Every structure is written in C-alpha cells, then in structure tokens.
Amino acid sequence: KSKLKPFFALVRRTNPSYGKLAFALALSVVTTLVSLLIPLLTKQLVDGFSMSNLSGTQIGLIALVFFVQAGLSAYATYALNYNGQKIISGLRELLWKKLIKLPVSYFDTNASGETVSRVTNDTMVVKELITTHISGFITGIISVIGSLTILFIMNWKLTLLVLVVVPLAALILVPIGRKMFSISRETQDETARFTGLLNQILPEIRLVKASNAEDVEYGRGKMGISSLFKLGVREAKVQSLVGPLISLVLMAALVAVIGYGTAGALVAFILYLFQIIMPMGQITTFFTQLQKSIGATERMIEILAEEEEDTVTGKQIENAHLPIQLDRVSFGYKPDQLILKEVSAVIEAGKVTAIVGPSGGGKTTLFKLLERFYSPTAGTIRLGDEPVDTYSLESWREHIGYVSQESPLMSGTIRENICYGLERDVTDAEIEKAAEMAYALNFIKELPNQFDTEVGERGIMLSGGQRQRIAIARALLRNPSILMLDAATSSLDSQSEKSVQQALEVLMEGRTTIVIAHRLSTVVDADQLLFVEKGEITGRGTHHELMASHGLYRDFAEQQLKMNADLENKAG
Amino acid sequence: KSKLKPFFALVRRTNPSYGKLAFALALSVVTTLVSLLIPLLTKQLVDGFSMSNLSGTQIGLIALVFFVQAGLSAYATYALNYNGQKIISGLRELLWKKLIKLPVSYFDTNASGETVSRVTNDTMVVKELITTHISGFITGIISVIGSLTILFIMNWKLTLLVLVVVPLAALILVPIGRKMFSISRETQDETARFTGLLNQILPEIRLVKASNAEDVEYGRGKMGISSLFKLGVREAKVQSLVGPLISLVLMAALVAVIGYGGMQALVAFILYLFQIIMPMGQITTFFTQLQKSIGATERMIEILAEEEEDTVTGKQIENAHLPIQLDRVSFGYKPDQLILKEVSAVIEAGKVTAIVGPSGGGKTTLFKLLERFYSPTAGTIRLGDEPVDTYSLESWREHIGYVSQESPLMSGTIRENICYGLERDVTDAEIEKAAEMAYALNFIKELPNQFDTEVGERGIMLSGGQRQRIAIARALLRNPSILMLDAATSSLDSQSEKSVQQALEVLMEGRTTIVIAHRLSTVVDADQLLFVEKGEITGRGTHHELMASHGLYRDFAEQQLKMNADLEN
Ligand SMILES: Nc1ncnc2c1ncn2[C@@H]1O[C@H](COP(=O)(O)OP(=O)(O)OP(=O)(O)O)[C@@H](O)[C@H]1O
Ligand SMILES: Nc1ncnc2c1ncn2[C@@H]1O[C@H](COP(=O)(O)OP(=O)(O)OP(=O)(O)O)[C@@H](O)[C@H]1O
Ligand SMILES: [Mg+2]
C-alpha cells in the first residue's frame, strides 16, 4: 500500500543482484573514505615535501599507485553499472515471459501496441537512475554521518540544531516527491499512448495515403507530442524547484546558530558545517529520482498479477481421439451482453462438419471458443463424455490446427512461417508435401528459392492470394487430428481450391474437420451442416436433408442459385 | 564526411534553440564566476565577522539573499533543460513529418515496426545528454581557462608543460571516442530490432497461441535481449575506462615538473594545479557523450534525405473527367525482376470494367500502380490523352476511392474510420447514407450507438464480416469519380452483396468503376473484362463475347459452373 515495498520486491525477483553489488558497494564505501582523507594530508605533506625530490621519486611512484588507486573508483562505477545493466535485463526478461502466457481476454481490452513500449521505455528509466540512485546515495550518507561526528560539539552539547537539518527538510520533499510521483506515472502512461498511436498508423501507410489523412495523422502526432511531451516539462519545473528548498531550510538552520549559541569553537564550526551541502545535494536527488522510478513502474506491477493462462496441468488425459460435444455453451464477450445462446451440437469423428451463417452471427467466435480461449459461464464443452478443461489447458491445442478468418504472418522468411509446429524436427523433406497438400509448391518454386524469399511485415512480400495458401500449410504441417479452416474461400481462386479439396480428403478420413466458408457450394457434400444465427442455431443434418425439411431460410441457397443460373443461358 | 557538421546542422533545423539558450548559457557563465570567487572571500570574511553577531546580522541577512542567488543556478538548470526539451521535440516533429510524406517504395524494404522506435528512442538519448552535454562543458571550459592564467608562471615562462596536458590527452580519447561511436550506432540499431520484433509478434497473439510458439517466441525475446542488451555492457566497460586514462596522462604532466622545473613558487604551483581535475573530468565526459549521440543519430540522418513523394505540383490539370488509358506499362517491384509486361488496355467512363486472374497474377499490383505509387519504367499511364503524372502527384488521389485486398482499420471508434475523406465537413446527416449504400446501418444500430463503439487494434472488436463492410463505406463517403473495389467477395455473404450491387448502380452511372473479384458470378454483366496472367493479359470484351471467341481458358468459368450444377439435382 506504501508504493515502496513492492518496488524492492520487484527487483528481488531478479535474483543475482545481491552477489556482485555487495562487492561493488563495498569498495565504493572505502572510496568515500579516501576522498574524505585526501585534502588534509597533502597540505601537511608538501610542507613535508619541502625536501621535495627525494621523497618524490619514491612518492611519485606512491602517488601514481595511489593515484592509480584513485582510478579504482572507475571499476566501482563499472561494476555498479554492470549490475545496473543486470537489473534492467532481468525486468525485460521477467516482463516478457509473463506477457505471452497471460490470457487473450486481456489483450482485447487494452491495446497491444500500447503495452509493447512498457517493455522498453518503462525499463530504461531505471538504467539512468541506478547510477545516480545508488552511487550518489551511498557517497553522501557516509559523509553526513562523517560530518556531525567531527562536528562533535553540535551532536552532544549543541544537538538542538542537527535535529533540525533533516526533519524540517523532510517536510519539504513530501509534496515534491508526491508531485514527482504523479508526473512519472503520466508520461510513462503517455509514451505508451504515443508509440501506440504510431504502430496503429505506420504499417497501414497504404490507407493513410487517402490524401487527406496525411494532413491529419501528422496533426495527431503533433497533438500527441507537443501537447503532452513538451508539456512533460512539468517534471523539469519541479525538478529544478528542489534547489532553493534544500538551502532555504538549510540556511534556516544557519540562522538558528545565533538563537542558541566559545568564539574559538564558532570559527571551526562554520568550517565543517559548509561541507554538508554537496553531500546534501546528492541525497535529495536520490529521493527525487526514486519516486520518478515508481510511477514509471507502478503500471508495470499490475501486469505481473494477471493469471498465467497456459498451465501444464494435464491430469491423466491428452491422447485419445473422441468426438466433440458442445453442451449448452453460452458465451459473453462482455458478461452483461452475451453473443452465444446455449448452443448444443455434436461433432462426430471422421466426417467434415460445416458451419454456415450470415454476417454477424457467431461463426468465428465459436472457433475461438473451440481453441479454449474463454470457456464461458453457462455450459460445458466435452469430448468423449469428458470435459475439455480437465485434459490440459493448452496441450490440447497441440492436437489441433487452426487458421484465422484473416491470414496472419509474422516477419517470416517463408519457411519459418510454417516451421514452429513440431518446432524441433521440421524434416525438410516433408514441408514440400505440406506445400503440395496446400497448392503452395506450384507458385513458390518460380520465386527465388523458398527459404531465400522474405515476406514483409504483415506479410506484404507475398500478396494476398499467396498469403492464404501459405497460412493453410501451417495447419497441414502440424498433422492434426482436428483441422479448423476458417476461410477456404478468402483469397484464392477456383483453380486453387479444387486441388485443396482433393488434397485433404486423402489426409482427413479418420481425422474430423470443422470448416466454415462463404458461398455454400464448397460444403454441399458435408456430412453435417449447421445454420447459426445471432448466437442461436436453427439447423442440422445434410444440406439436401436440410433444404427440404427446414423452412427457415429456403432461399439462402436460392440466393446463391439464381446468381449462377445466369451463366448457362449467357453462354448457351 | 566528418560526422560532426551534419549534427549541428541537424539541430539547426529546429529553429528556436538560439533564443532562450543564449540567455540561458549566459547566466550559467556568471554562475561559474561566483563559484570561482566564493571560497577565497569567506575565509577572510569570518575573521572580520568574528567582530560578532553585529558583523553577521545585517550583512548576513543579505548573505541569505546572496545565497538565494546561489539558487538562481537552478533557473539556469531549468532554462537549459527547457530548451533541452525543445530540441528533442523539434526532432520528433521534423522526423514525423518527413516520415509519412516519403514514398511507399521505401517501406516495403525496411520494416515499419523497426523504424517506429527511431522516433522515440533515438531522440530520448539526447534529453539525458543535453544537461551533461552543455552545462558540464561550459562549466569546465571557463575553469580551465581560469586556471592557467592564475597559474601565470606556467603559461608564460613554464609553458612547456601546459602544452602537454591537452594534446597528449587528446590522443587518448581518439580510439575511445571512435569506439564509443561504433557502439551507440549498434544499440540504437538493435533497440529498433528489438521493438520491431515485438510489434511483429504481440498483435498476432491469437496465432502465437499455437502452443509451441510460446516456448519459442519467448526464447527469441531472450535471445533478442540478453545476447544483445546485456551485451550492451560493452558501452559501459569503455565508459569506465576513461577514469584512469585522463589521470594517467595528467600525472605524466605531474612527473614532468621535475624534468624542467626541479633545478629552478613550487608550493603554490601544486595548489593551483590540483584544482584542474574536477574541471577536466567534465570536459572529457562531454566528448564521450557527444560521440554517443552521433551513432544514435547517424541512422536518423539518412531518413531525412528520402525524396518527399507527395508534391503539390498541380500544373494546370486536376478536374475534368476522362477515360483511363494504360499504355504498355511494365512494372518491376525489383528492377531486375519485373512482374508486369507492357500491359495495354483502356478504361472507358461510366461502365464497370473488371479484372479476373488466377492466384499469382498482377491483379492488384495493377491497382497499387493505379494509385500512382510507383509509375514504372517502360510505359506511361495517361487519361484523356494526357499523362497522369503531370496532373499532380497525389491530389489526383483525392478523386479516387480505394479499398485493399484486405480490410484495414486503424484504432477507429467506427465513425472516425469513415471520416477523414472530406476531413473537415463530414455532414453527420450523410454518413448513414454512406452506411445505407454499404449495407452497414442494418448491423450497426443494434450495437451500442455507432460513435460509442470502438474497434480493436486492427478492428478486432468488430467482426471479419463487419470489417469489410465498414471499409467499403470509406470509398462510398468520399463520393469519388472512380471507385476501386478489390474484394467484394472477401468477408460478406450473398445476402449482403446483393444489396451492395443494387446500391452502387444508383451511384455509379457516369462514374466509372474498376472492380476485381473472385468467383466470376459477380462480374458477369460487366461492360468489359480482362484476364490477366503472370504480368500478361490475354482477354478483352464482354464475358459472353470472351467465352465463345477466346480459346485460352474455355473452362475457367466451367471450373465454377460445375461447382454449382450439383445444387439443382
Ligand atoms: N470484442 C469481440 N470479440 C470477439 N467477437 C466479437 C466482439 N465484438 C463482437 N464480436 C462478434 O463476433 C462475431 C463473429 O465474427 P465471425 O468470426 O463470425 O466473423 P465471420 O466468421 O466472418 O462471420 P460474419 O460474416 O458473421 O462476420 C460477430 O458477430 C461480432 O458481433
Ligand atoms: N510488396 C510487394 N509489392 C509488389 N509485389 C509483390 C510484393 N510482395 C510480393 N509481390 C509479388 O507480387 C505478385 C502480385 O500479387 P498481387 O499484387 O496481384 O496480389 P493478388 O491480386 O492477391 O494476386 P492473386 O490474386 O493473383 O493471388 C505476387 O505474386 C508476389 O510475388
Ligand atoms: Mg473467422
């Protein structure tokens, strides 16, 4: 609740910080000791060196070493910074591993392109910190405890002033440190908004060439930056406010010396007291910059509490192959506004089931449900009269292939877009058979050499027709028990998909297959068919069995029949 | 060529840096003066102050006021940092405006998700810099010139040592500054690779749940970070190397005082000489961190030389409406491997032309050409017997609508996905007619209130079916002379698109329309049709005119006829 205890708990999860820093902090302490001891000895030494040269050859060597050991402080600056580079790299490690094992039901709410900078830019603020953080704080805290003990009159008999220098200053940093905390949470919640704007803009540059967007999306960037980030000077204004305020209470201690305070002691008293400031200007800098870190990490804390959606809790059950039964499952994408209404159907093995619905139904959502992404409230999904959750959470995903309604590809270099299914044993003499079972090898070999070809970002390299045929090979290399085709009519011609339908029939005969498609002439011979509508389903059986029996549509097909009856009489 | 002259030229383009910094640098100079003058006066003052409380009270209250002007240094630290915040914001301004006016023929080569961080993270390295950069450099350079003049014996009669302290140190920083420059260009060319990895991964999280990717794409991140960025400690190792090496030449000057002065003031000479180090430790820090900036900006320079693809060179010609003629245009996406082979066809006005080709042809690469993105080598594109380049470069884009083969949407809040065509005069009582002409208003009004609805990143809140119908409204709000539909069969059903075809026929009758589509039953009544194949075209005329006459395919249609003959029997 104190916003401080989790932060040291946060760096605690990066384990190996304790080892080398403990050595690294130690020699920086004695670095403060030798810098304490240096200016008093040389002024007596030179008087000592009036003798000069003799003491000098030997002491020249001595000083070189000594002065070489004055350069040993650089090794402390190195070794702190090395463990400084360790602690940031542990954050980026632990942030990234949590980031992909968390449920997909998070990412739909908040902006994948926003949270990505919270890996980078909400760590790099601790790199610049941890030099000024540690090294400045330790070098002062020994000097201030080194001051008042040698200011021995003022901590045993004149204590009533050295109990004013810290606590009255401590009241001053409290609104500053709180305001410093309310700023660093804002900028770091706006760097993420700023980078999130651009990654939702820059890959879509072909649309932003709409010739009126370029005068506008530039204007959104400037309104992104200058109204916020030059308005990030609000940090720097308060940052410079600390200057007078440390002194404005410190000189208040200085005027206090006449209210309570022989004369031979007063002159030495001023001499030691003015050695406090360059120490005191460091410790307050640390307490400022510390609260800068917290607001830059307070957002990063909450994304370490979301609940680890991939479990490997496989109880006794992964392997056998049984039919799939949906049992009154009703899904809500938002729990007060649901779109699926206790649908109940059975997916028998070895036979291609299909799903056909109009635009706006629950077609694709039932597929994302059948990857067990949500497993909603009312209803259970079972297989073999066994509930699908208790098998495992996502080792059951391994048995299934899946292609989306769109065709997604990462920064591919084509052969790696197909590869990571079996992920270790790709068997290069088999990918071409997965290409031949997808009509891919025909229009790949004329390109420069399948490996050597590189797709774009979202896969621009290849085009749109080649995109869909590439992604369908991903499911046909994983060799699944259960296929899941979402759009086999998406971006491909009738010449292609006839080879596709004639290919997977050799594959899938004891391996059941759920495929939805537009344009019902691709699922006419399916062994089952469904007609889903707005979260409800009103159909069963074969298409010929459904056309004569059911009287709901009776022209969904005839909407597509009359679009094809024109082609006969126009040709003959 | 010197890698330095463009950098000061780079900040020169951010104009207003000259104004306030000149005031800001000035009072920091006299801040160095008062810090020079302070420790000598007080030690003589306290002996005169011991003339009691009286000596202190009334002069000392001004000394508090004097100590308030010691806090005036903070205002210099502020005003430097304020102009420090100005110069970074000018970079992000000038980088962003150049970034979107440059040709699309750049972005296909290098990785939009890579170059985006070069807006942010290759500017923020100058923010931390410019405090340590300027303020540290100015506060030393006056002190070192303030030292040797008060070390007056050693710059007129013992000069032969103060001509060693700088130039022999200057040899030492040369490999360091060069190595420091070869490091900062690497990390900043790897922050961009690291962020570019994630934005090509994180929005595709539904695919990365392939259950074997999570154990792998996590491993690519760690191999991204730890093999490179904990290996970014190579900076910090050389960064700490400067410590001995400034002194290891400085004490070499110290041993030199007996080689020329030992046979011949010496006690006061040591006292002023040891005041040089905390100055000298600042100036070398500046020359280190300066070369850190250059490698973090050398990549940023070259993206200010690419050539401004939107010109507003409209010569005399924007407005009239004439047919479109392609004349032997041959496009290469790579100039030694071209895919379009001097295609020649004519697009007559008022009549829907279509294009149908198999997978792998040049069907869209002719649409992206028809937005004048490339305008390739062999051949000219003309309209009205007038070449299309000399009209304007992209004010001609305003007359045209266009939807892609995919359906793209930005972070929308639906009404803003349709809005920025006319971009100032959206006329809220008309968007619904642009929705009614796209079969959008039917399945929008049941959602929570068209404005209030928000799509996802790539429209993931909306459907796939709803995505395509939304994007097609964008062209039907701009009210074009020329439509360009790329996939009216993409993600939409036969119930939808029959309304779509029956809608735009009321719109397009004197407004010509180029539409490609799968599944030839949507272009059967087109007034012209083309059959493009691998960059070549082998068809003309009407479909019924092409089916009997041409003998190339003769079963491209029959490939789709026999798939529909099963539905009757
Ligand atoms: N936030 C959301 N997440 C997931 N699905 C949503 C969300 N909001 C709405 N939906 C619904 O998801 C449904 C299913 O989309 P689907 O996968 O069926 O697209 P499709 O298969 O192309 O079919 P359609 O043609 O009906 O869009 C849509 O009806 C849409 O209303
Ligand atoms: N970024 C790119 N720019 C231009 N051409 C590309 C690019 N990436 C790949 N290509 C090549 O351009 C060819 C043309 O594809 P096109 O633009 O016609 O897409 P398409 O209309 O979907 O093609 P099809 O419908 O024939 O599959 C592809 O075969 C591909 O080899
Ligand atoms: Mg889908």
Ligand SMILES: [Mg+2]
């Ligand atoms: Mg296309």
